[PDB]
Short mmCIF file of C-alpha atoms and ligand atoms in Angstrom, two decimals:
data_model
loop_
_atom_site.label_atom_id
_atom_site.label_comp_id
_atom_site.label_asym_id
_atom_site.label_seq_id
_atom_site.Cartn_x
_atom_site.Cartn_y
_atom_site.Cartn_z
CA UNK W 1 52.46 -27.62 79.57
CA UNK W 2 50.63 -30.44 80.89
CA UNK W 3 47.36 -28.10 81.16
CA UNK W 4 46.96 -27.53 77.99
CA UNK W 5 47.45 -31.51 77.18
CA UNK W 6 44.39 -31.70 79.47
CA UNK W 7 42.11 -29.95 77.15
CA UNK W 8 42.07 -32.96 75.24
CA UNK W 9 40.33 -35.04 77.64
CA UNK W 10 37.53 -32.14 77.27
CA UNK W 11 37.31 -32.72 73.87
CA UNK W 12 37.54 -36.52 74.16
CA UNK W 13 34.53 -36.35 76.64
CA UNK W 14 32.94 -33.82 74.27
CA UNK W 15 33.29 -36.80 71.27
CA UNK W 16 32.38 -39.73 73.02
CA UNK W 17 29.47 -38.23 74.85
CA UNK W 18 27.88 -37.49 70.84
CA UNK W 19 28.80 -40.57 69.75
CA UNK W 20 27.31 -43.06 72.91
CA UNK W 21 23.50 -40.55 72.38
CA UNK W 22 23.43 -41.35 68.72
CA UNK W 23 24.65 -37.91 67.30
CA UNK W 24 27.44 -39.28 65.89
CA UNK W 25 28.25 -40.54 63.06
CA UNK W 26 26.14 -38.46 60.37
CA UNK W 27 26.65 -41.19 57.62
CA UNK W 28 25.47 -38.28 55.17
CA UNK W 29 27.69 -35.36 56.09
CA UNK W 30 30.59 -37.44 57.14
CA UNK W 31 30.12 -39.88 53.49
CA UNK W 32 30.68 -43.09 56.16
CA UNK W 33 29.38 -46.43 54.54
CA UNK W 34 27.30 -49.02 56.26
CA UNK W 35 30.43 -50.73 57.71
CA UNK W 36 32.38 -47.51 58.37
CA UNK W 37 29.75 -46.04 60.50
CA UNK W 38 29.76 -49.69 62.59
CA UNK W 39 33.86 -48.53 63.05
CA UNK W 40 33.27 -45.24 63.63
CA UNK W 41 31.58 -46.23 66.50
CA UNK W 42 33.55 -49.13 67.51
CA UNK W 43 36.84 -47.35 67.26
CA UNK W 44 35.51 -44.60 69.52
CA UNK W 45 34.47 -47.18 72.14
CA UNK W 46 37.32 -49.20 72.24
CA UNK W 47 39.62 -46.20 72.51
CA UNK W 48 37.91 -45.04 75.96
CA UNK W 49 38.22 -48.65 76.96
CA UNK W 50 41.93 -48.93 76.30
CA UNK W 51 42.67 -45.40 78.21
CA UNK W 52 41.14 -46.99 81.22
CA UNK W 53 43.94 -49.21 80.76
CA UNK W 54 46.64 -46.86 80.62
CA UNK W 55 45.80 -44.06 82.93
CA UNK W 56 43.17 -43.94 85.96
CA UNK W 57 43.57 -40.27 86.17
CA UNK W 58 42.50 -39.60 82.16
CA UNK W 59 39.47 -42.22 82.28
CA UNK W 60 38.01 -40.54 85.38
CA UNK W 61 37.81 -37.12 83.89
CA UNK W 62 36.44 -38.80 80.30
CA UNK W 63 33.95 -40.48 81.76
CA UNK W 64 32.46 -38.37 84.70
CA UNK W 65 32.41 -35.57 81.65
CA UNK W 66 31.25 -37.66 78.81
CA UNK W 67 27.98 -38.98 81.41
CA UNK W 68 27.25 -35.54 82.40
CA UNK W 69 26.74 -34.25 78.91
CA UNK W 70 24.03 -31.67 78.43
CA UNK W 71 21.83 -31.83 74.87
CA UNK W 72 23.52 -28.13 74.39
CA UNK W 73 26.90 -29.38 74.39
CA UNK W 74 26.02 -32.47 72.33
CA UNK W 75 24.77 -30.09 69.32
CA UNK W 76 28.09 -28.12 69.59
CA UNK W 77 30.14 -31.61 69.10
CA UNK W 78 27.68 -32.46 65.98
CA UNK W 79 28.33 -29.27 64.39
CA UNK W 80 32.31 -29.24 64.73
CA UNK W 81 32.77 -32.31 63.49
CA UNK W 82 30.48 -32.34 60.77
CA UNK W 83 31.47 -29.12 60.02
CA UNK W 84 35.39 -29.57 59.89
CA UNK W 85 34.17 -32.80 57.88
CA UNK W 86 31.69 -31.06 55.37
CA UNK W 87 35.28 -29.11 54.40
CA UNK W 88 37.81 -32.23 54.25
CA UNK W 89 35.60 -34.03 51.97
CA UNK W 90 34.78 -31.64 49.30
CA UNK W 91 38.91 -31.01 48.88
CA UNK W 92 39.11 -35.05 49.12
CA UNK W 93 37.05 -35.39 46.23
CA UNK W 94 38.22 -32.51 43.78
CA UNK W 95 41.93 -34.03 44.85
CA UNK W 96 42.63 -37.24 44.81
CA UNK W 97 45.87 -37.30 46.40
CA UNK W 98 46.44 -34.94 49.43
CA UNK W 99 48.41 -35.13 52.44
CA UNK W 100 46.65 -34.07 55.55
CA UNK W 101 48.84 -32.29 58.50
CA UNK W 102 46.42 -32.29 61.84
CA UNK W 103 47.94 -29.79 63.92
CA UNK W 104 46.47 -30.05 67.70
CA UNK W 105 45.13 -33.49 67.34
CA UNK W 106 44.86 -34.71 70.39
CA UNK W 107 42.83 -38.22 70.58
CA UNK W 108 40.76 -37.29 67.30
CA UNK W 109 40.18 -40.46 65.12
CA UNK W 110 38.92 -39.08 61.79
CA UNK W 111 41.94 -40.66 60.31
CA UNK W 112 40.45 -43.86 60.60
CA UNK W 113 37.73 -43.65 58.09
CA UNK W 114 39.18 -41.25 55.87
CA UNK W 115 42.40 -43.45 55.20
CA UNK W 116 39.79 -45.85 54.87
CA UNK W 117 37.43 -44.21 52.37
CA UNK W 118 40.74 -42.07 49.83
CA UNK W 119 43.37 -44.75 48.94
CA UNK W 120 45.81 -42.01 48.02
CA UNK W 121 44.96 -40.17 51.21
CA UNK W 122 48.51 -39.23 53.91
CA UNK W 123 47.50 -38.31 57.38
CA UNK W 124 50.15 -36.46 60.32
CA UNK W 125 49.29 -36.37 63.37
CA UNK W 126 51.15 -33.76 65.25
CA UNK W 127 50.86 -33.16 69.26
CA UNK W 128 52.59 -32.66 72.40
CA UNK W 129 55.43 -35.48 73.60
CA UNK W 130 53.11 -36.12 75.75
CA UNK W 131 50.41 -36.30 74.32
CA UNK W 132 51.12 -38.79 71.83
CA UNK W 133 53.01 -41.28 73.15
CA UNK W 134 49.37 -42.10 75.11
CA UNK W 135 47.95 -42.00 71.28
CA UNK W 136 50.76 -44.61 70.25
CA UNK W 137 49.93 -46.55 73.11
CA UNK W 138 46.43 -46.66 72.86
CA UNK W 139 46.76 -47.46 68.94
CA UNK W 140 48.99 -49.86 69.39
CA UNK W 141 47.03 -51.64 72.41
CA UNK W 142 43.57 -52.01 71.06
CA UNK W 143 43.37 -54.78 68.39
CA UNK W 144 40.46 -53.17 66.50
CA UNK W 145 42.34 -49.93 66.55
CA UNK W 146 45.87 -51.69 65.57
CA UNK W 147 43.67 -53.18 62.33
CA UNK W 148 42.36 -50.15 61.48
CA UNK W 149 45.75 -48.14 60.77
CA UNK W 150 48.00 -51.56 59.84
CA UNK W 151 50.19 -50.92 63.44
CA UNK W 152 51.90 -54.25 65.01
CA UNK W 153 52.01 -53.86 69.43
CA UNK W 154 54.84 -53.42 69.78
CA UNK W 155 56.86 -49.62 69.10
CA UNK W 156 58.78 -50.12 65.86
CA UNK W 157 58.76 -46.97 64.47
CA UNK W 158 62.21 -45.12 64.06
CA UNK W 159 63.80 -41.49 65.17
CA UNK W 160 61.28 -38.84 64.56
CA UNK W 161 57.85 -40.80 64.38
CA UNK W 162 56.35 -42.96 66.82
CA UNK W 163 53.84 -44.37 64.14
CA UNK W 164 55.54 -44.74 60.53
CA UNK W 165 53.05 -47.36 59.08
CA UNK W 166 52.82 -46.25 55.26
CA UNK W 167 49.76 -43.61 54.89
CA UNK W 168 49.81 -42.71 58.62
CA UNK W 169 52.26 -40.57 60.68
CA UNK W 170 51.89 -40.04 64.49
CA UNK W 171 54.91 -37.13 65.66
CA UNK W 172 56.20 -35.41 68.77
CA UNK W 173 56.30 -31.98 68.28
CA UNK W 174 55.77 -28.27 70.00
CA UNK W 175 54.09 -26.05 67.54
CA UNK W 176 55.28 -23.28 69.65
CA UNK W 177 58.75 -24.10 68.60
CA UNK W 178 58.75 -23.11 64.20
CA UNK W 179 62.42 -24.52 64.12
CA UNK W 180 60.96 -27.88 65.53
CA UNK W 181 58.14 -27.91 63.08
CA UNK W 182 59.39 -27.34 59.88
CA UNK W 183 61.93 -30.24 60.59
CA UNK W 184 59.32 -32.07 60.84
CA UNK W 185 57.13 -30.95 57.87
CA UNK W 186 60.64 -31.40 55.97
CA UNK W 187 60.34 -35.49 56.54
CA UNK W 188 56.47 -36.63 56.35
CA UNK W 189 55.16 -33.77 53.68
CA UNK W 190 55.82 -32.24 50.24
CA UNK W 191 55.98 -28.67 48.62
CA UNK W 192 53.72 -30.16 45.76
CA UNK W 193 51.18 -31.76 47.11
CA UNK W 194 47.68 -30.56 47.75
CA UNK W 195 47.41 -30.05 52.00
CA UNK W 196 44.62 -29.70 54.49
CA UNK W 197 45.97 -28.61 57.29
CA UNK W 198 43.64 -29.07 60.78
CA UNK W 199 43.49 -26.95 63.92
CA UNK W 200 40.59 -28.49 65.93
CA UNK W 201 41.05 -25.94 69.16
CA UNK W 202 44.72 -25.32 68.89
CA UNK W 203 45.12 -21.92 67.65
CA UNK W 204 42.99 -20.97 71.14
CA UNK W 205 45.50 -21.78 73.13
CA UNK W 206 48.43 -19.96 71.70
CA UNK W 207 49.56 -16.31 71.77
CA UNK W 208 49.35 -14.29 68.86
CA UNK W 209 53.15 -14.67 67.80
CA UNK W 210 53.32 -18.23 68.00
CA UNK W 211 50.60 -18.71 65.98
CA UNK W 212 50.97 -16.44 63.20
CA UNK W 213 54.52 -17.73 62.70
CA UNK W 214 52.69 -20.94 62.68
CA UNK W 215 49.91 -19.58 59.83
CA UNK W 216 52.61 -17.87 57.87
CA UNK W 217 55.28 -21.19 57.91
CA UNK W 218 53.12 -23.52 56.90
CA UNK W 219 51.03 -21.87 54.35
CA UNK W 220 54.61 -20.58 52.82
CA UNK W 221 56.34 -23.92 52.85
CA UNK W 222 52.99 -25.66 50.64
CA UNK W 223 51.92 -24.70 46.74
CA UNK W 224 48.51 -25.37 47.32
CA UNK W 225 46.28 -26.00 50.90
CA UNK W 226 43.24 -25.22 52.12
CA UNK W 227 43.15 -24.69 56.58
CA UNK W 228 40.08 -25.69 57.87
CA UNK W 229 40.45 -23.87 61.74
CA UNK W 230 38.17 -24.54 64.71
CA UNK W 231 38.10 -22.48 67.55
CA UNK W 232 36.23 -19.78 70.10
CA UNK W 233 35.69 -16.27 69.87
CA UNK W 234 35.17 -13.93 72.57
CA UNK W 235 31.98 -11.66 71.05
CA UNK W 236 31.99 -8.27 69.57
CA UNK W 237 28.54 -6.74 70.23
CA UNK W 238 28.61 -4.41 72.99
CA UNK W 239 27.69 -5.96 76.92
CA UNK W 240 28.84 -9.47 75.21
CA UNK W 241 30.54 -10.88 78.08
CA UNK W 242 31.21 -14.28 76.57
CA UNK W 243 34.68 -14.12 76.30
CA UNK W 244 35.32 -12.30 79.18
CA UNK W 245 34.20 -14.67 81.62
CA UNK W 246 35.29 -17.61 79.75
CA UNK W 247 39.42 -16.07 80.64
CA UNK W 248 38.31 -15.61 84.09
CA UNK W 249 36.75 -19.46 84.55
CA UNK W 250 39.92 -21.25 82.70
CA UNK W 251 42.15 -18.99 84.44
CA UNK W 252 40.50 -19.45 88.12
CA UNK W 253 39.22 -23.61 87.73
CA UNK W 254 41.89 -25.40 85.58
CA UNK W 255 44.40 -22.22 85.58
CA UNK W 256 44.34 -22.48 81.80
CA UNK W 257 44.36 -19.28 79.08
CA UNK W 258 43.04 -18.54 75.79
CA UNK W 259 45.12 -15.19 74.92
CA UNK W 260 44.06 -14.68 71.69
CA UNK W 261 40.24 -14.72 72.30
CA UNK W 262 39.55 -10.56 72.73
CA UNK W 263 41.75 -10.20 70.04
CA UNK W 264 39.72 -12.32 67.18
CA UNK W 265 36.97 -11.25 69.04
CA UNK W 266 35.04 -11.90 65.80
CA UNK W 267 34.79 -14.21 62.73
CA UNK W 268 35.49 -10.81 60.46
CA UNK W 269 39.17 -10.61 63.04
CA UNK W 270 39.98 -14.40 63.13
CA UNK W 271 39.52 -14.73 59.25
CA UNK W 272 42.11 -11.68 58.69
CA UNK W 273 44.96 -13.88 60.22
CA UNK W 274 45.01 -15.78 57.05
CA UNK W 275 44.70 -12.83 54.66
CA UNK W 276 47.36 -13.92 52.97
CA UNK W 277 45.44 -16.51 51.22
CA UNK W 278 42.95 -14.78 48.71
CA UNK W 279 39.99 -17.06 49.38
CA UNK W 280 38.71 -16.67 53.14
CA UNK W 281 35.33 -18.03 54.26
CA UNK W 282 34.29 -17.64 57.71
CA UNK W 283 31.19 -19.03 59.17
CA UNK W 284 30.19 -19.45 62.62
CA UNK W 285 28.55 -22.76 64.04
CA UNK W 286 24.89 -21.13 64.50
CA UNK W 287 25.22 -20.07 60.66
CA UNK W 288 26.49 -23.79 59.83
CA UNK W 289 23.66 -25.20 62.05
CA UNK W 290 20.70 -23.48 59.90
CA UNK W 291 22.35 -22.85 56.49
CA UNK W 292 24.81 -26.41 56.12
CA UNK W 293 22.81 -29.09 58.02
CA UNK W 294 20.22 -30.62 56.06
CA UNK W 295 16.06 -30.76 57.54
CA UNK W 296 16.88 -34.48 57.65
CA UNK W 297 19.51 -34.14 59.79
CA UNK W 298 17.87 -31.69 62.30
CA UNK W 299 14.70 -34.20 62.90
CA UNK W 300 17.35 -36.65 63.15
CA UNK W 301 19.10 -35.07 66.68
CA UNK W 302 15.35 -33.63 67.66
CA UNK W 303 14.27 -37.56 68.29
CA UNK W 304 17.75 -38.20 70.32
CA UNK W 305 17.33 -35.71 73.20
CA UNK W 306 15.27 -32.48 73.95
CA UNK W 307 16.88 -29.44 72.84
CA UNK W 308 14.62 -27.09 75.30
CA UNK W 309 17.10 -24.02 74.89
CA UNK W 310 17.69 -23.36 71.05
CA UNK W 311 18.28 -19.82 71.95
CA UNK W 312 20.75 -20.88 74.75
CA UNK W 313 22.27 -23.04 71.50
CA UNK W 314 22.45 -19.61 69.44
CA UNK W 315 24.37 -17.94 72.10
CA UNK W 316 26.93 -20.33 72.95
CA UNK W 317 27.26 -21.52 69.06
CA UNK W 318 27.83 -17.87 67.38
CA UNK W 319 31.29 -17.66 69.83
CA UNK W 320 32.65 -20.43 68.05
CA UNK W 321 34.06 -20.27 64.51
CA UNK W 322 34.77 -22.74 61.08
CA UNK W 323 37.32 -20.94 58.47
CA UNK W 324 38.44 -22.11 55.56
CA UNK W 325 41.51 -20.74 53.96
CA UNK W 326 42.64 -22.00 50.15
CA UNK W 327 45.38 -20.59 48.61
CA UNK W 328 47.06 -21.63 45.22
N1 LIG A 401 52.03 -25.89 71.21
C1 LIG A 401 51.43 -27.06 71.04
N2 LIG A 401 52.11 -28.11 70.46
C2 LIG A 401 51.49 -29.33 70.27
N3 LIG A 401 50.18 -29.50 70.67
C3 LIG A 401 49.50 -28.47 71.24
C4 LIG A 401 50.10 -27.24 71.43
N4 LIG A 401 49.20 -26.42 72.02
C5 LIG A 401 48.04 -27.10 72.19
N5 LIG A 401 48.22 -28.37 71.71
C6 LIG A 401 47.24 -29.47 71.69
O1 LIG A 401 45.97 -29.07 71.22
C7 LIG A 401 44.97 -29.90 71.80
C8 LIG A 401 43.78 -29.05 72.22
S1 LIG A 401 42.34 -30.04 72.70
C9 LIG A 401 41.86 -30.41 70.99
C10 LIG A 401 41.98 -31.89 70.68
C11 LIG A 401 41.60 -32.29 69.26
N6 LIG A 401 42.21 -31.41 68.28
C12 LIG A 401 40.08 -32.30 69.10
O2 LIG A 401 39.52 -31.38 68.52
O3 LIG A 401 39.40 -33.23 69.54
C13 LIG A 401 45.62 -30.63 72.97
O4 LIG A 401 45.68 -32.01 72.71
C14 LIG A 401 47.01 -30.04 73.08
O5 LIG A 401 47.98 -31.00 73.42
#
């Protein structure tokens, strides 16, 4: 579906729009060095630059979006990425060498610095056809970006991967399909290797069967994980129409659907999908925002832009969701 490839242009817009105000990067939260937070930046900028280059269409939406930012939405972008971060790095740490599988990833360049930062770190990117063959293009075009992962310009990777440069992986693959992504798992991971598997706004945009298969596969087929899942929630106190009209806006504007968000209506529902795993935490981003984030870090975004509406934050924050499942 080539809608649902377009919801990473949202989230591109979302990123680059943090990143260009100064939210972005946390050197704290993120552990970036002096130099890394320099790349973090530059490897951000130059990969808006280079999708000019290969697609009018996909720059016009980035850019119009990432320009028309609100302070609200900028405060949601710090909090998922420092949030999905705060999680990677403490499993990073405690293992030394782990293989990460990012399900849904879209044009998301945490790889980058975390290749960067754990020697004995893998990394799999996984998306739509698509999808990333614009990733492999954009890599491979930028010459900041093509230092970065250690890619030459031109495609030489064989079969299966379209990026096969030693600790990085970029694949073609429907998640949809289980049959077409355990072949995959079968060739870039290991049953004995500590995982983190990622699924930055993925799970949304599946129905229920698809992605339980999906939950149930993959934490099956690895000894020891830990699934660090972003996504929405539709509200479950009464008169909450949150999720309700955000069905009816995809549906009617981008004719796009989210049909598992009235299910997992709530962080209690959306945890008990991965109640197979006996250690469940699940926090939404309003609770992350107050408990997580340092008083460093909030003065920090207060001298960036003016946050007028912190209640209009609370509302739109507590219908989004960070769980972590670890199982052993
Ligand atoms: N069945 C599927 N197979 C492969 N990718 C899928 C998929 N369903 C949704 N996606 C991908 O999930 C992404 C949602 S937008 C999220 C982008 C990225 N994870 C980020 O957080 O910045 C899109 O890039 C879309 O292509």
């Amino acid at each position: 579906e080539r809608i649902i490839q377009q919801t990473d242009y949202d989230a591109l817009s979302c990123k680059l729009a943090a990143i260009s105000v100064g939210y972005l990067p946390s050197s704290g939260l993120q552990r970036l060095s002096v130099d890394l937070s320099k790349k973090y930046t530059e490897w951000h900028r130059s990969y808006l630059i280079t999708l000019k280059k290969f697609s009018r269409r996909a720059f016009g939406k980035v850019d119009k979006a990432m320009r028309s930012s609100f302070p609200v939405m900028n405060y949601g972008t710090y909090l998922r990425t420092v949030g999905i971060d705060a999680a990677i790095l403490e499993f990073l740490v405690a293992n030394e060498k782990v293989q990460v599988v990012n399900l849904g990833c879209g044009s998301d360049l945490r790889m980058l610095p975390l290749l960067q930062m754990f020697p004995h770190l893998a990394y799999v990117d996984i998306d739509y056809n698509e999808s990333v063959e614009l990733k492999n293009s954009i890599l491979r075009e930028s010459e900041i970006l093509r230092i970065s992962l250690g890619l030459s310009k031109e495609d030489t990777a064989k079969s299966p991967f379209l990026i096969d440069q030693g600790r990085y992986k970029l694949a073609a693959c429907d998640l949809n399909d289980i049959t077409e992504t355990t072949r995959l798992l079968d060739v870039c991971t290991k049953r004995e290797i500590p995982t983190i598997v990622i699924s930055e706004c993925l799970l949304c945009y599946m129905h229920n069967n698809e992605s339980q298969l999906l939950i149930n596969t993959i934490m099956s087929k690895f000894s020891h994980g830990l699934w660090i899942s972003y996504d929405p929630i539709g509200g479950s106190q009464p008169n909450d129409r949150f999720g309700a009209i955000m069905q009816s806006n995809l549906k009617e504007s981008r004719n796009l659907e989210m049909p598992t968000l009235m299910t997992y209506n709530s962080k209690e529902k959306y945890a008990s999908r991965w109640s197979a795993a006996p250690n469940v935490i699940v926090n939404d981003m309003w609770e992350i925002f107050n408990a997580q984030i340092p008083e460093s870090e909030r003065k920090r975004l207060r001298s960036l832009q003016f946050l007028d509406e912190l209640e209009e934050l609370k509302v739109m924050q507590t219908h989004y969701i960070l769980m972590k499942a670890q199982w052993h």
